[PDB]
Design a protein around this nucleic acid. Structure first.
Ligand SMILES: Nc1ccn([C@H]2C[C@H](O)[C@@H](COP(=O)(O)C(F)(F)P(=O)(O)OP(=O)(O)O)O2)c(=O)n1
Ligand SMILES: [Cl-]
Ligand SMILES: [Cl-]
Ligand SMILES: [Cl-]
Ligand SMILES: [Mg+2]
Ligand SMILES: [Mg+2]
Ligand code: NA
Ligand code: NA
Length: 326
DNA sequence: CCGACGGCGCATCAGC
DNA sequence: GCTGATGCGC
DNA sequence: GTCGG
């Protein structure tokens, strides 16, 4: 909030480029700038001052000077007053509707919540659930509720097979006081980078969570990644809790560290860390860290026994989860 | 200048 | 049916 | 939109 006005602005611009312009690199450029400025420990006084930060160039510097002097950005003022842009931006807030589908729906005249509700038949499964819980999915989850959800998840998976280990990652692992959803990393000794000695490992867990009515809907589901909806149980006469988004990722037990590093995020932190990795001659994904041979092709996985080992390879001092919120 | 920008799971679809 | 490209998401 | 070779 120290430079909240500016970071909000950049984030709006980022969303515009992504949702309306369908210019993903501009989206990432604005988010990185917003990110680096967000952690700058001083109340920015000018675009020039901001341009010193990495990720902030000439264009954003000018915008920062406009925002600082007028308190607003004409470029955004116009975007807001543009019906097509406003429609597209709104529609993309429904989970399952991205930049493309939003523009297409608008072409059909489907541009409001009311339009979507009356044309449910024109949405795929994911979009339909996103619409169904539109209001709920925008609500934040207090950490206290995250704690209650964690308890249910770990206890239920334990009941399935005491050998499963479920770790809540995402902003929760980063110590956030509220999260947008729950991200669960799941491992089991039967599934390694060497073999899958037991099928349905993810399925069984999803099944159990559905049996107890924790998981209520499914957006997508595969062998290693589940994307759905869940809800905490409420007491008698007690109003129900909002439905929440839940992501479950099954990862080879031997590649847990690259996995937890990936799922802990933040997304921008991963982008920055993986970019740094490449500059240092390495490539990092959720399974391994590999050196990039002279040719440019990834080599064999390097030994990893802690999150810190990954950091050492790329010559970065270790950073606790709570400091990875970029 | 201008090529690169992190990396990948699941749903859907065109082409064969 | 498969496979590769695209959309959307983590 | 920003960066580095
Ligand atoms: N583009 C991305 C997106 C995600 N992630 C990894 C790194 C992320 O930490 C992790 C979770 O994705 P999430 O989509 O639940 C998130 F990001 F919003 P979270 O950080 O959890 O914040 P919140 O509380 O609001 O959900 O996936 C990634 O690597 N790249
Ligand atoms: Cl772009
Ligand atoms: Cl690992
Ligand atoms: Cl790999
Ligand atoms: Mg999350
Ligand atoms: Mg998530
Ligand atoms: Na800069
Ligand atoms: Na969406």
């Amino acid at each position: 909030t120290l430079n909240g006005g500016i970071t909000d602005m950049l984030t709006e611009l980022a969303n515009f480029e992504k949702n309306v312009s369908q210019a993903i690199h501009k989206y990432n450029a604005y988010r990185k700038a917003a990110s680096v400025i967000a952690k700058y420990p001083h109340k920015i006084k000018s675009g020039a001052e901001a341009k010193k930060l990495p990720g902030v160039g000439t264009k954003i510097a000018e915008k920062i000077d406009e925002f600082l002097a007028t308190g607003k950005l004409r470029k955004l003022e116009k975007i807001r007053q543009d019906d097509t842009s406003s429609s597209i931006n709104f529609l993309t807030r429904v989970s399952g509707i991205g930049p493309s589908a939003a523009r297409k729906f608008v072409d059909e005249g489907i541009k409001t919540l009311e339009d979507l509700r009356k044309n449910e038949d024109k949405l795929n499964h994911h979009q339909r659930i996103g619409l169904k819980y539109f209001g709920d999915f925008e609500k934040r989850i207090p950490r206290e509720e995250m704690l209650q959800m964690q308890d249910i998840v770990l206890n239920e998976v334990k009941k399935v097979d005491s050998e499963y280990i479920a770790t809540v990652c995402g902003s929760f692992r980063r110590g956030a006081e509220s999260s947008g959803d729950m991200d669960v990393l799941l491992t089991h000794p039967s599934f390694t980078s060497e073999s899958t000695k037991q099928p349905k490992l993810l399925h069984q867990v999803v099944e159990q969570l559905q049996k107890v009515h924790f998981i209520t809907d499914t957006l997508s589901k595969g062998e290693t990644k589940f994307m759905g909806v869940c809800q905490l149980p409420s007491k008698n006469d007690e109003k129900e809790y909002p439905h929440r988004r839940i992501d479950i990722r099954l990862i080879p037990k031997d590649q847990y560290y690259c996995g937890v590093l990936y799922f802990t995020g933040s997304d921008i932190f991963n982008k920055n860390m993986r970019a740094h990795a490449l500059e240092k001659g390495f490539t990092i994904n959720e399974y391994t860290i590999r050196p990039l041979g002279v040719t440019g092709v990834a080599g064999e996985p390097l030994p990893v026994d802690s999150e810190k080992d990954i950091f050492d390879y790329i010559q970065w001092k270790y950073r606790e989860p709570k400091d990875r919120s970029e």
